[PDB]
Structure formats: C-alpha cells, structure tokens
Amino acid sequence: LPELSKKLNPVLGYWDPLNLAELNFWGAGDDATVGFLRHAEIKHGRVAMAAFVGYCVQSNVHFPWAPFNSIPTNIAPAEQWAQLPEAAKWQIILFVGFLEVYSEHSFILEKYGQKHYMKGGKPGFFPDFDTMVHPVPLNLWDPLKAYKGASAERKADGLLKEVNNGRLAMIGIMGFCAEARVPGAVPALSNIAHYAGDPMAPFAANFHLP
Amino acid sequence: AVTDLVGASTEVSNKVWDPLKLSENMDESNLKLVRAAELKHCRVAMLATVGWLWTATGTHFEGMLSTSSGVSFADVAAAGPLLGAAKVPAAGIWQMIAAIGALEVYWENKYPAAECGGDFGVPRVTQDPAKFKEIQLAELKNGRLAMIGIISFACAEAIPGSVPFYPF
Amino acid sequence: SAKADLEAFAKECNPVVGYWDPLGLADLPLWGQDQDAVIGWLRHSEIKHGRIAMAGFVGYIAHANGFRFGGIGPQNVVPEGASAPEVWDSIPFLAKLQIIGAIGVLEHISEDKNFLAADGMKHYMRGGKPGYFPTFSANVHPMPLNLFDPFKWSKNASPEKKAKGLVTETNNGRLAMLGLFGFLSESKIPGSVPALSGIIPSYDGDYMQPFLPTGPDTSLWTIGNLWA
Amino acid sequence: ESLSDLKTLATGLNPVVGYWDPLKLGEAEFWDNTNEETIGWLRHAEIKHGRVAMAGFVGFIVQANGIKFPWAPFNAITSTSPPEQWDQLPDAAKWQIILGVGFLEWWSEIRVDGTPHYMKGGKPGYVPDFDATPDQLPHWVGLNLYDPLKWSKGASAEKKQKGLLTELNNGRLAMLGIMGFVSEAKVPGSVPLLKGLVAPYTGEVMAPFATDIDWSSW
Ligand code: CLA
Ligand code: CLA
Ligand SMILES: CCCCCC(=O)OC\C(C=C=C1C(C)(C)C[C@H](OC(C)=O)C[C@@]1(C)O)=C/C=C/C(C)=C/C=C/C=C(C)/C=C/C=C(\C)C(=O)C[C@@]12O[C@]1(C)C[C@@H](O)CC2(C)C
Ligand SMILES: CCCCCC(=O)OC\C(C=C=C1C(C)(C)C[C@H](OC(C)=O)C[C@@]1(C)O)=C/C=C/C(C)=C/C=C/C=C(C)/C=C/C=C(\C)C(=O)C[C@@]12O[C@]1(C)C[C@@H](O)CC2(C)C
Ligand SMILES: CC(=O)O[C@H]1CC(C)(C)C(=C=C/C(C)=C/C=C/C(C)=C/C=C/C=C(C)/C=C/C=C(\C)C(=O)C[C@@]23O[C@]2(C)C[C@@H](O)CC3(C)C)[C@](C)(O)C1
Ligand SMILES: CC(=O)O[C@H]1CC(C)(C)C(=C=C/C(C)=C/C=C/C(C)=C/C=C/C=C(C)/C=C/C=C(\C)C(=O)C[C@@]23O[C@]2(C)C[C@@H](O)CC3(C)C)[C@](C)(O)C1
Ligand SMILES: CC(=O)O[C@H]1CC(C)(C)C(=C=C/C(C)=C/C=C/C(C)=C/C=C/C=C(C)/C=C/C=C(\C)C(=O)C[C@@]23O[C@]2(C)C[C@@H](O)CC3(C)C)[C@](C)(O)C1
Ligand code: KC2
Ligand code: KC2
User: Fold this and answer.
1) How buried is residue B136: exposed, middle or buried, by Cβ count under 10 Å (0-12/13-18/19+)?
2) Where in the cell is it found (chain C) (predicted)?
C-alpha cells in the first residue's frame, strides 16, 4: 500500500515492519505487489467483519427453518460448523467459490470501467453482476440500489473506514476463535465456548485428508 | 569452433564447460563427431531411463517371450531391471542388436557423424532458430541428466547404499 | 550545545557541586548517535525516574497509611492494611496488566513523533526538550483535559519560572529516589536505613518483579457481566 | 592484491595488528592462477567459514537450550548434545540438508547477473540475487537468500563496508567458539570455562552418517 495510510491513521501510517511492498510477488511488479496486498487487506476484513457480527447472532438465536436448526446453541459455533451435514459444508464453500471466480473475471471487471486489482484496478470492487448467463433480481453489493448515489467523499471515507474496521475485526474474530480451544487465551473474555477441534479444518468431523 | 555449438549451459554461467580442455585441439569433423556421440548417448540414455522405470515399476508385456524355452515377460520383469537382463534368450539379444545395427548402418551411410553432427533429419517441431536453439539446449540438458540417471540406476541396483534417493 | 547545557543545568541544580559526572556519563553515545542524543536520553531518563520516584513516595505513604477510595473497585479485594509492598500482590492480574498497559500507552504517546509534531515539539534525543509530554487533542475521541495541566492552571507562568520549577522537580526527584530506595531497602534488609528501621515490615517477594504473585481473577462488577 | 589486503586490516583492529599471517598464505598462486585470484578465493573462504560458524553457533545455543521444532520428525529424537541430534537424524534428512546447501552454493557460484566472479574481481561472499535475472532460473522463487525482505536495500556504502568488517570479525569469533564447543564434545578438560557444560561424545564430529573411526589414537 502507498503512504496514504496517514489518512487511515496518523501517528502511525505505513508502519510496515515486514516490508512486503517490493518482494515482486511472482515476478509481477511493485504496483502488482501493492494491488494484491490491498485486496487481501480488505477481503480478509470483509470476511472477518461479517464473521464477528456473524458470531454474535449465531450464539444466541438460530434461524427456525429446519436443517441448520435444532442443533445445540449453548456450544461453540466453531463446533456448530462441525455439526453441519457434509453437503452443507460443500455448498457453502462452493457458493463462495463462485463469488471468488466471478469477481476475478477481468472481462466482467472491464464492463464497469475497472480492471483486475493489481493490473491497475481498484483493490475491492465486486462486479455489478449484470452479465451472467441468466438474470437474477438481486446483486451482491448495494442490493437495493440504495447508496450508490453518494458522492466520492462518502465513498473515500467509507473505503478508509472499511479498512480500519477491517483491521479491528481481524483481531476481533481470531482472538475470539483462539478462546474456544486453548482456554484462557483472552483474559478479557474468558467466559465463552469450549471444544478443542481445529477451526481451520472444515471437514475434520467428516473425513480425513490422507 | 567449440564456442559456437549449442551446449553452452546457464548452469555453468552460459560458458563452455571443458575443465580438462578435451576440445582445445580437436578440429572440425571430430568436434561434430564428439557432438554426435554425445547426442546419441543423450537419446539412448533417455530411452534407457524410461525403459528402466517401466521395468522397475513392474509394467511388462503379457505373453511368452520365447515359447521354446519358457521365459515370460513376467519372468523377465520379476527378476529386476538389472538381473532380468540375462533372462532374455540370446537369440532375442542378437535380434535386437541386429535391428539396431541395421538402423545404425543406414543412418551412418545416409548421415555420417563426421559431417552431420547428430542430425539425422527427423522432421522438426519449430522454425525461428532462436526457439530451435532453446529446444536443442533442452534436448542436451535432458540427455545429460538421463546419462547420469541411468548409470545411477545401474549402480543403485548393483551396489546397494549408493544413490540414497533411489526409488525401489 | 549538549555539554554546555548540561553544565548549566548542573550549576543551576546546585551552585556548589556544579558538573558532577564521575563515570563519564555525558560522553557515551548509546545507539551510536553522537553526544547530543546521549545527553538528551540521560536527561529524559533522570526526569522520568525522578517523577516516578515522587509519585512512588506519595503512593507508598498512601498505601502505608490506608486511604481506600470507595467500593466496587480494586479496594474491595485488597486487605484492610497490608503495607505498600503487598498492595501490588493482592490486586487482580487483569488490573495490574491494564495498569501496565495504560502506563505504556502514556509513554508511547509521550514518545510518538506525530504527537510531538502536533504540539510543535520534537523528539528528546534529536534536539528536543526532555520530559515534555504531549497534550491530548488528536486521539479522535475528545479528551476532557490534558495530562500535564488538567485545569490549565499554569498557562501564564514565565519561562524563568518554568526553568526554576524544572530544576526544583529534578532536585525533589533525586531526593524522592533516595527516599524510595531507602524505604525499599528497609522493607527487605534491616540495618540499611537507620532512621526508617522498624517502621516498614519485611517483604518476602522482591520488589523488582511485576508478575511476582499473580493476583486473583475476581468479577467485581455486575449488570451485564457476561465476562464471568 | 596484497595491498588492499592491508587496507582491509588497518580497519580490522586499528594498526594494533595488520597483515598478520605467519605462514603467509598471501602472495600464493595455488591451482595455476595469479595472486589476485588466490586472494579473492581465500577471502571468500574466510567469509563463508565465518557465516557458517555464526549460524552453527546460534543453532548450537538454541538446540542445547532446549528449543526444538514440535512438528513431526524432529519430535522423535530426544537428546541434547547437538552433535548426537545430528547423528540420530534420518539419513534422508541429512542428505537433503547437504543437497539444499549444495544447491544454494551452486547458485552462489553462478554469475549471470553480476559481471565478476569473486576470483575474477567480484565481492567475496556475495550471493547473487535471485530476481535480478528472472528468465535464467528453473522456476520462480521470491524471498532471496541474502536480504529476503529487502531490509537493507538502500543503505550507505560506508554502512556496507562497516557491516562487512563486523561480519568478518564476528565470523572469526564464531569460528573459535564453535570449535571450542566441538572440542568440548570431544576432549574434556580442553577449552576452560566450558568444562561444566557440554556432554561427552564420540563419533568423529567432522563426519556425517556412519561413525566408529575417530581420532582415538590422537
Ligand atoms: C558420452 C559423454 C559425453 C560426450 C562425448 C560429451 C561431449 C561434449 N560435451 Mg558434454 N556432458 C556430458 C557427457 C558428454 N558430453 C554429461 C554427462 C554432462 C553432464 C555433467 C555434460 C555436460 C556438458 C556441459 C555443461 C558442456 C558440455 C560440452 C560438451 C562438448 C565440448 C566438451 C568436450 O569436447 O569435452 C567432452 C569430450 C569427451 C570426449 C568426454 C568423454 C567422457 C570422458 C572421456 C570420460 C569421463 C568419465 C567420468 C568422469 C566418470 C564419471 C561420470 C559418471 C559415471 C558420473 C562436447 C561435444 C560443452 C559444450 O557443448 O559447450 C559448447 C559444455 O559447455 N557437456
Ligand atoms: C550391430 C550393432 C551396432 C553397430 C554396427 C553400431 C554402430 C555404431 N554405433 Mg552403436 N549401439 C548399438 C549397436 C550398434 N551400433 C547398440 C545395441 C547400442 C545400445 C543401445 C548402441 C549405442 C551406441 C552409442 C551410445 C554410440 C554408438 C555409436 C556408434 C557408431 C560408432 C561405434 C564405434 O566407434 O565403435 C565403438 C567404439 C568403442 C571404443 C566402444 C565404446 C567403449 C566404451 C568406452 C565402453 C562401453 C562398453 C562396451 C561398448 C560394451 C562391451 C562389453 C563390456 C562388458 C566391456 C557406429 C555408427 C557412437 C556414435 O555414433 O558416436 C559418433 C555412440 O556414441 N552406438
Ligand atoms: C531437483 C529435483 C531433482 C530430481 C531428480 C532428477 O532430476 O532425476 C534425474 C534422473 C535420475 C536420477 C536421480 C539422480 C539424478 C541420480 C539424483 C538422485 O540421487 C541423489 C541422492 O541426489 C536420485 C535420482 C533417482 O533422483 C533421471 C532423469 C531422466 C531423464 C531426464 C529422462 C528424460 C527422458 C526424455 C525422453 C524419454 C524424451 C522423449 C522424447 C521423444 C521420444 C521424442 O521427442 C520423439 C519425437 O517424436 C517427437 C515427439 C517429435 C519428433 O519431431 C522428434 C522425435 C521423433 C525425436
Ligand atoms: C541502591 C543504590 C541507589 C543508586 C545510587 C547511585 O547510583 O547514585 C545515583 C545514580 C547515579 C549516580 C551517581 C552520581 C550521583 C551521578 C555521581 C556519584 O558520584 C559521587 C559518589 O559523588 C556516582 C553515582 C554513580 O553514584 C543513579 C541513581 C538512580 C536511582 C536510584 C533511580 C531511582 C529511581 C526511582 C524510581 C524510578 C522510583 C519509581 C517508583 C517506584 C519503584 C514505585 O512506585 C514503587 C511502588 O510501586 C511499588 C512497586 C508498589 C507500591 O505498593 C509501593 C510503591 C508505590 C512505592
Ligand atoms: C451513506 C452510505 O453510503 O451508507 C453507509 C452506512 C452503511 C449502510 C452501514 C454502509 C455499509 C455497509 C455495512 C454492511 C457496514 C457494516 C459493517 C460491519 C458489519 C462492520 C463490522 C465491524 C466489526 C468490528 C469493527 C469488530 C471489532 C471487534 C473487536 C474490537 C473485538 O472483538 C476485540 C475484542 O474481542 C477482544 C479481542 C477481546 C474482548 O474481550 C474485547 C473485544 C470485544 C474488544 C456503507 C455503505 O458503507 C456506508
Ligand atoms: C493449539 C492451538 O494453537 O490452537 C490454535 C489453533 C490454530 C489453528 C493455530 C488457530 C488458528 C488460526 C490461524 C493461525 C490461522 C492462520 C491462517 C493462515 C496464516 C493461513 C495461511 C495461509 C497461507 C497461504 C494460503 C499461503 C500461500 C502462499 C503462496 C501461494 C506462496 O508462497 C506464493 C509466493 O508468492 C509468494 C507469496 C511470494 C513470491 O515471491 C514467491 C511464492 C511463489 C513462494 C487458533 C484459532 O489460534 C487456535
Ligand atoms: C545495514 C545494517 O544496518 O545492519 C543490519 C543489517 C544486517 C547486516 C543484515 C543485520 C544482520 C544480520 C545478522 C543476523 C547478524 C547476526 C549475526 C550473528 C548470528 C553473529 C553471531 C556471532 C557469534 C559469535 C561472535 C560467537 C562467538 C563465540 C565466542 C567468541 C566464544 O565462544 C568464545 C569462548 O569460547 C572461548 C574461545 C573459550 C571459552 O572459555 C569462553 C567462550 C565460550 C566465551 C543486522 C544485525 O540486522 C543489522
Ligand atoms: C461482508 C462484507 C462487507 C462488509 C462487512 C463491508 C463493510 C463496509 C463498511 C463498514 C465498516 C464500510 C464503511 C464499507 C464501505 C464501502 N464498501 Mg463495504 N463491506 C462489505 C463488502 C463490500 C463489497 C463486496 C463492496 C463494498 C464496497 C464498498 C464501498 C465502495 C463503493 C463504491 O465506491 O462504489 C464502500 C465505501 C464496494 C467497493 O468497494 O467497490 C468500489 C464493493 O463492491 N463492500 N463497507
Ligand atoms: C549465516 C549467515 C550470515 C550471517 C550470520 C551474517 C552476519 C552479518 C553481520 C553480523 C555479524 C553483518 C554486520 C553482516 C553484514 C553484511 N552481510 Mg552478512 N551474514 C550472513 C550471510 C550473508 C550473505 C549471504 C550475504 C551477506 C552480505 C552482507 C553485507 C553486504 C551487503 C552489501 O554489500 O550490500 C553486509 C554489510 C552480502 C554480501 O556480502 O555481499 C557482498 C551477502 O551476499 N551476509 N552480515
């Protein structure tokens, strides 16, 4: 990332202990090194901000439909992933797998004027979805077509706020996920969750890799 | 004229590797001859490595190699790649050597090694001579690695303990 | 520049002793950065040590007498009179860790480059005034008052009065360092402090360890206490 | 260049010592070359020995302290005497260590980007950059061997030569230290102030894999 982290944070700003901004990243370049890191900055933020907010709803209430229901609620939601059926785990990952594959298509990205992020495009820009083989009513970002009329000042403030709330939540969920197993990790919480199974193992409760 | 060839490898910093200076005073019609010998060694070594891997993995044909005196392809394969070389009957060895020698005689009379430095005129997969020099260098490097590898296989099958990372 | 100012400050602290530097402390550059940085680092360390010494003397007097503020907080778990050394052994481990974190945050705010740059000051080792803590007008959340002057009761003092106050602070800090070290010695080894012998009790745990005797967890708070 | 050898050493330990070699390995010719090539070779040998010695000394301190890789195959062996840990390693592990080091120095010998070899005028102990010539390596790897994160990168040349002198001095001291530790493992009573440490050990330290020859008859 450039030295415009002063806008995101003064006092600090382009802290960068491990340099990482010129390691040339598969021989692509220095601009492409910056572009890949900025996307993985906020893609990890967007997952973590949704997962931490996702945590605070799962642990209290469950959707009353049927399949991901009636399993115990007074347990770790990391364990509640392991209680899902195998078809549910595959369909969750593959649904995100479509979103990853679709968003990286450079011919879709050039429909709206942008480019792939480390070829010069914006780091985080999900496509407006209107080029699929079959039409859908609702797209992903701004589904109700609500807040795309805002000026660039609100977008620039929001983009910086997305990063800063991103960095805060990546600490938030992972420190929380480090409290479920190895208890007593965070002495601020220390009153939630159990279970020593690996959260970084979606199919550990179903099969084994070898 | 040894500085031209193709064999200048970037693994030795893109210069000619002759520490014993064997090609210092060798002249044309011998430099082409030693290049032809190297190329034939390359090709025979690559074919030998593939055949050795096929025999060591076990593959073999199905049938009887010499119905007069037993010896199936499974019998040849089960003795090992090296010890299963004398299991072949002598007539089969002589017939293989005769066919290889007929090919050798035909190609030597058609393309002499002193005049044609390993070039027997097999089609050619590309024009644009820079790409062809790259493909020639790839052939040379693969053949040299196979030259080392087949002797490594023979040493590891005969003397155990040598070649520590030898499969089977 | 550094040596002349050091000699002037030494003369102002005491007109009789003047420059008293026995073990060449004004000449050894710490991180290979000339004598000015060494002099600034030594002055800042002396000022911080003296301030910590005066605050520690006040805290030792308060803890020895016993002047607990109210309820609910950390005084509800400490014993009703256990002298100063054991007051850092019965407090909660989370409480002591948070106090250490607050002290480190204050030190980092005092040492931050942009925190000094916003106030118009510089770093104390590259041509700055040692002990000049920056104000609190940049942390986005509105701070009610600054740390140096909370009620801003010294905004009209002269520079000569400021220099005299700094010299008095340095001298009182040296005296408080001597007194606090004497109290610590008399709390562990009898016969060190002759006047203070028999007042303070004996402490088993050495006073040079922060994590000596880990404190109890303790909830000590209600209304939404989901964190045990 | 038996003159720059003195300029390097006037900054080595002041003029307190200088060009000190009792048997005079300088002004030599060696394998049918010139004195400059021999001087460059000897400088590279000293630098490489020093680097290997500092790495080995740090590894000995870490291994004898008790810090050990949890993972899987290193958890199997449970000793302390670093040399015995190497001895009870699997043969494949030792061979892969040796061959990886051999690949690294094979790359170190290759000069496809920097014009001179360390004998033909290049800097001694200079590992060439991986990404300087990205079309002349078998497959791309980032994170170069020297300075993986480009921490030095832009630095003053005075700082570079000062670091080279510091590396040389630290290398010589680490050479002495690691040979002291090895002789502690072999010869008790030798190397005072270290007798209370290190374990007795046999098996010809300067030999991997099999054992049982040794300098038993001194
Ligand atoms: C049949 C073997 C053979 C032959 C005839 C050649 C022939 C040639 N090589 Mg070559 N090479 C070989 C195997 C061989 N190579 C192998 C296995 C490797 C990989 C290590 C290489 C790697 C190599 C490089 C990197 C280069 C050459 C080059 C050359 C050419 C010029 C050098 C020269 O005349 O000296 C070779 C002439 C000989 C007559 C050598 C015969 C073999 C000797 C007499 C026996 C050696 C025994 C050996 C040491 C025992 C251990 C080997 C094995 C068991 C492990 C020449 C056409 C150079 C070139 O073309 O540049 C333009 C060049 O740069 N070669
Ligand atoms: C009837 C069979 C026959 C005939 C006529 C030829 C004819 C020829 N071959 Mg050839 N070849 C054959 C079968 C045959 N090949 C078979 C079955 C193989 C194995 C697949 C080869 C592998 C082979 C290679 C790899 C090379 C030739 C070469 C040559 C040419 C020169 C040969 C030479 O100088 O003598 C041979 C001269 C020698 C000095 C013998 C080599 C001695 C080496 C150092 C030791 C090898 C062991 C030895 C050959 C085996 C004997 C038994 C052993 C226990 C001692 C010539 C066109 C060479 C060529 O064209 O280069 C220009 C060449 O490089 N051939
Ligand atoms: C860093 C990784 C290293 C991996 C190891 C390695 O590298 O193994 C190397 C190795 C063995 C080995 C080892 C050592 C080298 C000794 C090292 C290890 O010992 C230790 C402890 O270190 C052990 C071991 C076993 O590993 C062996 C290498 C073997 C090799 C390299 C084999 C190439 C075949 C090419 C062929 C057959 C081409 C056919 C091509 C053909 C047939 C054609 O083109 C047909 C053609 O019609 C086409 C298509 C177009 C036409 O116009 C032209 C013609 C008619 C010509
Ligand atoms: C034991 C020996 C003492 C040192 C003697 C010494 O070296 O001299 C002076 C010197 C340097 C010097 C010399 C000169 C004077 C320059 C010249 C001399 O030449 C002559 C002979 O003329 C030579 C020399 C070398 O002597 C350096 C001295 C430095 C010193 C002594 C600096 C103390 C800071 C105090 C602090 C930071 C307090 C913090 C506050 C603390 C620790 C606390 O709050 C403790 C406490 O919270 C705890 C933990 C729990 C609570 O419940 C209780 C309380 C609240 C109490
Ligand atoms: C005008 C316009 O356009 O519309 C506006 C408004 C509008 C609609 C909202 C917009 C939007 C989009 C959305 C959906 C925005 C929502 C974003 C979302 C959902 C953001 C989650 C953040 C989660 C965080 C920061 C977690 C921190 C987590 C923390 C700090 C921790 O857990 C740490 C901690 O746990 C430890 C480690 C130990 C504990 O003992 C103590 C605590 C708890 C402190 C726009 C479009 O962007 C802009
Ligand atoms: C008992 C205990 O500890 O409980 C713990 C268990 C556990 C699991 C530790 C916990 C956790 C969570 C953790 C630690 C989660 C961490 C997840 C993490 C960190 C996952 C990294 C993925 C890395 C990838 C995909 C790398 C790709 C890398 C690639 C593809 C490359 O290297 C390509 C490369 O191009 C570069 C980039 C540079 C180029 O020049 C060169 C090359 C070609 C080489 C808890 C919750 O704390 C609790
Ligand atoms: C440009 C710049 O700004 O620089 C930057 C960038 C740069 C250069 C890349 C950097 C670096 C790289 C590194 C990692 C540098 C560190 C190198 C390393 C690891 C250096 C180990 C030495 C080990 C020794 C000397 C062991 C001695 C051991 C000795 C002397 C002994 O045992 C002696 C002794 O045995 C006797 C003889 C007899 C016994 O009776 C007594 C004892 C036991 C005492 C830095 C550090 O980040 C700084
Ligand atoms: C679960 C996922 C998720 C979360 C939790 C989340 C939270 C926040 C927060 C709260 C801290 C803010 C303040 C914020 C702000 C902005 N977001 Mg998020 N956002 C998420 C996902 C996406 C996606 C997929 C896209 C996107 C975008 C934008 C744009 C720019 C729009 C514009 O400039 O047109 C702005 C200003 C779009 C994009 O950046 O395209 C340029 C885009 O496609 N966002 N976003
Ligand atoms: C075991 C590994 C190891 C250790 C323990 C170690 C210790 C030290 C110490 C502390 C004692 C210093 C102070 C120091 C300093 C320098 N090192 Mg070392 N170094 C090690 C490895 C390498 C390698 C592989 C290279 C290298 C180099 C340089 C350069 C030159 C930079 C430049 O000229 O830009 C400088 C200044 C490069 C080189 O010499 O290039 C001519 C190079 O390739 N170093 N190094």
Assistant:
1) middle
2) Plastid, Chloroplast
